């Protein structure tokens, strides 16, 4: 659900997920995707595509379990939708941490119809 995802982001990036990522670029994050604005914005774009190939569960609402072991998000699920969900959220979080150096506050509260239409996933 959002709690797990924001936690992962927080734990990986060290940033307040809602602040840094709640409204960042054309895809990070809360209302569809869009021509990524940069590395960070592209992370959320893949995250959404990752979301859409998900079936038995809702990624806003369904909670899953995960572990922090050796400073690594370890998914705790066998359930397929939750495992993939957990893995989509995990990878979004990694990807956001890896691209922090290009993170640009200029796109933090970007207005989202200032966004080009996204390519199908
Ligand atoms: C510290 C607990 C975190 C819960 C707050 C929710 C965080 C939401 C921001 C997640 C950023 C990517 C979201 C998305 O693109 O759907």
- The C-alpha atoms of residue 25 and residue 33 are separated, in whole angstroms, by 9
H or E element at residue 75: strand 73-75
H or E element at residue 84: helix 80-98
Query: Among 71, 62, 91, which Cα is nearest to 14's?
Result: 71
Q: How far is the CA of 89 from the CAs of 41, 46, 116, in angstroms?
A: 15, 10, 24
By the 8 A CB rule, do 4 and 92 touch?
no
Residues with CB under 6 A from ligand 1: 2-3, 5-7, 9-10, 17-18, 21-22, 28-30, 44, 47
3-state SS of 28-74?
A: CCCCCCCCCCCHHHHHHHHHHHHHHCCCCCCCCCCCCCEEECCCCEE
Residues 6+ apart with CB under 8 A from 18: 6
Nearest CA to ligand 1 atom 14: 29
Q: Go through the domains of the chain in sequence order and give each one's CATH number.
A: 1-121 (1.20.90.10)
The method recorded for this entry reads: X-ray
CB atoms within 10 A of CB 118: 16
Atom of ligand 1 nearest to the CA of 29: 15
Kindly give the distance from the C-alpha atom of residue 50 to the centroid of ligand 1, in angstroms, as a whole number: 15
The pair of structure tokens assigned to 102 is 């290009």
């Amino acid at each position: 659900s959002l709690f797990e995802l924001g936690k992962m982001i927080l734990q990986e990036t060290g940033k307040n997920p809602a602040k840094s990522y709640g409204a960042y670029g054309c895809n990070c994050g809360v209302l569809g995707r869009g021509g990524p604005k940069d590395a960070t914005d592209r992370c959320c774009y893949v995250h959404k595509c990752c979301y859409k190939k998900i079936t038995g569960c809702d990624p806003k609402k369904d909670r899953y379990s995960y572990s922090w072991k050796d400073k690594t998000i370890v998914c705790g699920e066998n359930n397929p939708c939750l495992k993939e969900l957990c893995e989509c959220d995990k990878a979004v979080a990694i990807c956001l941490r890896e691209n922090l150096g290009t993170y640009n506050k200029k796109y933090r509260y970007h207005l989202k119809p200032f966004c080009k239409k996204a390519d199908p996933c």
